[PDB]
Write a protein that binds this ligand. Sequence first.
Ligand code: HEM
Ligand code: K
Length: 123
Amino acid sequence: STLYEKLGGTTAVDLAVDKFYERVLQDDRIKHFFADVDMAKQRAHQKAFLTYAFGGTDKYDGRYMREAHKELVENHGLNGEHFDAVAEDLLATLKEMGVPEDLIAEVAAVAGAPAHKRDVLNQ
Ligand code: HEM
Ligand SMILES: [K+]
Protein backbone atom coordinates (compact mmCIF):
# COMPACT_ATOMS: atom_id res chain seq x y z
CA SER A 1 0.00 0.00 0.00
CA THR A 2 0.73 3.67 0.61
CA LEU A 3 2.99 6.41 2.01
CA TYR A 4 4.05 5.23 5.47
CA GLU A 5 5.32 1.91 3.99
CA LYS A 6 6.84 3.30 0.77
CA LEU A 7 9.03 5.85 2.62
CA GLY A 8 9.75 3.57 5.56
CA GLY A 9 7.55 4.73 8.42
CA THR A 10 6.39 7.71 10.54
CA THR A 11 9.63 9.75 10.82
CA ALA A 12 10.52 9.35 7.14
CA VAL A 13 7.06 10.49 6.05
CA ASP A 14 7.23 13.54 8.36
CA LEU A 15 10.67 14.35 7.00
CA ALA A 16 9.47 14.23 3.36
CA VAL A 17 6.34 16.25 4.13
CA ASP A 18 8.19 18.91 6.18
CA LYS A 19 11.00 19.38 3.60
CA PHE A 20 8.42 19.64 0.77
CA TYR A 21 6.35 22.11 2.82
CA GLU A 22 9.48 24.18 3.56
CA ARG A 23 10.58 24.40 -0.05
CA VAL A 24 7.12 25.37 -1.34
CA LEU A 25 6.71 27.96 1.43
CA GLN A 26 9.95 29.67 0.31
CA ASP A 27 9.16 29.37 -3.41
CA ASP A 28 8.10 32.82 -4.59
CA ARG A 29 6.74 31.30 -7.82
CA ILE A 30 3.92 29.59 -5.97
CA LYS A 31 3.80 30.47 -2.27
CA HIS A 32 0.92 32.94 -2.92
CA PHE A 33 -1.46 30.15 -3.88
CA PHE A 34 -1.50 29.39 -0.18
CA ALA A 35 -1.96 32.95 1.07
CA ASP A 36 -5.63 32.55 2.18
CA VAL A 37 -5.10 29.30 4.03
CA ASP A 38 -3.40 28.66 7.38
CA MET A 39 0.01 27.08 7.89
CA ALA A 40 -1.50 23.78 9.08
CA LYS A 41 -3.57 23.51 5.92
CA GLN A 42 -0.61 24.41 3.69
CA ARG A 43 1.36 21.48 5.18
CA ALA A 44 -1.63 19.18 4.91
CA HIS A 45 -1.68 20.02 1.19
CA GLN A 46 1.97 19.16 0.64
CA LYS A 47 1.20 15.87 2.43
CA ALA A 48 -1.70 15.19 0.09
CA PHE A 49 0.36 16.01 -3.03
CA LEU A 50 3.18 13.77 -1.81
CA THR A 51 0.75 10.92 -1.06
CA TYR A 52 -0.69 11.26 -4.53
CA ALA A 53 2.70 11.35 -6.23
CA PHE A 54 3.86 8.19 -4.43
CA GLY A 55 0.70 6.43 -5.58
CA GLY A 56 -2.14 7.06 -3.14
CA THR A 57 -4.22 8.32 -6.06
CA ASP A 58 -7.45 6.73 -4.69
CA LYS A 59 -8.53 9.51 -2.30
CA TYR A 60 -7.94 12.28 -4.86
CA ASP A 61 -10.72 11.84 -7.38
CA GLY A 62 -10.15 13.93 -10.52
CA ARG A 63 -13.51 15.66 -10.00
CA TYR A 64 -12.45 16.64 -6.49
CA MET A 65 -9.11 17.84 -7.92
CA ARG A 66 -10.94 20.02 -10.46
CA GLU A 67 -13.16 21.59 -7.84
CA ALA A 68 -10.47 21.88 -5.12
CA HIS A 69 -8.24 24.03 -7.36
CA LYS A 70 -10.97 25.96 -9.17
CA GLU A 71 -10.46 29.17 -7.16
CA LEU A 72 -6.67 28.97 -7.78
CA VAL A 73 -7.39 28.74 -11.52
CA GLU A 74 -10.09 31.42 -11.49
CA ASN A 75 -8.82 33.76 -8.76
CA HIS A 76 -5.07 33.22 -8.29
CA GLY A 77 -4.06 32.80 -11.95
CA LEU A 78 -2.95 29.18 -11.53
CA ASN A 79 -1.38 27.81 -14.68
CA GLY A 80 1.03 25.08 -15.83
CA GLU A 81 4.17 27.02 -15.02
CA HIS A 82 2.96 26.97 -11.40
CA PHE A 83 1.93 23.34 -11.49
CA ASP A 84 5.40 22.45 -12.76
CA ALA A 85 7.10 24.54 -10.03
CA VAL A 86 5.38 22.47 -7.31
CA ALA A 87 6.23 19.16 -9.05
CA GLU A 88 9.85 20.33 -9.37
CA ASP A 89 9.96 21.32 -5.65
CA LEU A 90 8.86 17.80 -4.67
CA LEU A 91 11.57 16.21 -6.78
CA ALA A 92 14.20 18.59 -5.45
CA THR A 93 13.09 17.62 -1.88
CA LEU A 94 13.42 13.90 -2.69
CA LYS A 95 16.88 14.47 -4.18
CA GLU A 96 17.85 16.38 -0.97
CA MET A 97 16.74 13.21 0.85
CA GLY A 98 18.89 10.90 -1.29
CA VAL A 99 15.84 9.13 -2.83
CA PRO A 100 17.20 7.34 -5.97
CA GLU A 101 16.98 9.32 -9.23
CA ASP A 102 15.12 6.42 -10.90
CA LEU A 103 12.56 6.27 -8.05
CA ILE A 104 12.12 10.05 -8.13
CA ALA A 105 11.30 9.62 -11.84
CA GLU A 106 8.56 7.13 -10.82
CA VAL A 107 6.75 9.65 -8.62
CA ALA A 108 7.64 12.44 -11.15
CA ALA A 109 5.54 10.63 -13.76
CA VAL A 110 2.61 10.34 -11.32
CA ALA A 111 2.55 13.83 -9.74
CA GLY A 112 2.96 15.37 -13.18
CA ALA A 113 0.63 13.07 -15.15
CA PRO A 114 -1.52 14.73 -17.85
CA ALA A 115 -4.97 13.77 -16.44
CA HIS A 116 -4.05 15.17 -13.02
CA LYS A 117 -2.40 18.32 -14.40
CA ARG A 118 -5.53 18.74 -16.58
CA ASP A 119 -7.81 18.42 -13.49
CA VAL A 120 -5.73 20.76 -11.26
CA LEU A 121 -5.50 23.36 -14.05
CA ASN A 122 -9.21 23.09 -14.84
CA GLN A 123 -8.48 22.19 -18.44
C1 HEM B 1 -0.33 16.06 -7.26
C2 HEM B 1 -1.23 17.10 -7.56
C3 HEM B 1 -2.14 17.58 -6.61
C4 HEM B 1 -2.99 16.93 -5.80
C5 HEM B 1 -3.27 15.45 -5.70
C6 HEM B 1 -3.63 17.98 -5.04
C7 HEM B 1 -4.64 17.79 -4.07
C8 HEM B 1 -5.35 18.71 -3.29
C9 HEM B 1 -6.42 18.37 -2.36
C10 HEM B 1 -6.89 16.99 -1.94
C11 HEM B 1 -6.82 19.55 -1.85
C12 HEM B 1 -7.91 19.81 -0.85
C13 HEM B 1 -7.51 20.08 0.60
C14 HEM B 1 -8.78 20.19 1.36
O1 HEM B 1 -9.89 20.15 0.74
O2 HEM B 1 -8.71 20.29 2.61
C15 HEM B 1 -5.98 20.51 -2.51
C16 HEM B 1 -6.04 21.90 -2.24
C17 HEM B 1 -5.26 22.94 -2.78
N1 HEM B 1 -4.28 22.62 -3.71
FE1 HEM B 1 -3.74 20.97 -4.53
N2 HEM B 1 -3.21 19.29 -5.28
C18 HEM B 1 -2.34 18.98 -6.30
C19 HEM B 1 -1.59 20.05 -6.87
C20 HEM B 1 -1.60 21.43 -6.60
C21 HEM B 1 -0.76 22.40 -7.24
C22 HEM B 1 0.24 22.10 -8.32
C23 HEM B 1 -1.04 23.56 -6.63
C24 HEM B 1 -0.53 24.83 -6.88
C25 HEM B 1 -0.19 25.66 -5.85
C26 HEM B 1 -2.06 23.19 -5.66
C27 HEM B 1 -2.72 24.09 -4.80
C28 HEM B 1 -3.78 23.90 -3.86
C29 HEM B 1 -4.44 24.95 -3.09
C30 HEM B 1 -4.07 26.42 -3.00
C31 HEM B 1 -5.39 24.33 -2.36
C32 HEM B 1 -6.39 24.92 -1.37
C33 HEM B 1 -5.93 25.12 0.08
C34 HEM B 1 -7.16 25.19 0.96
O3 HEM B 1 -8.02 26.10 0.74
O4 HEM B 1 -7.30 24.34 1.90
N3 HEM B 1 -2.45 21.87 -5.60
N4 HEM B 1 -5.05 20.07 -3.45
K1 K C 1 9.24 4.78 12.33
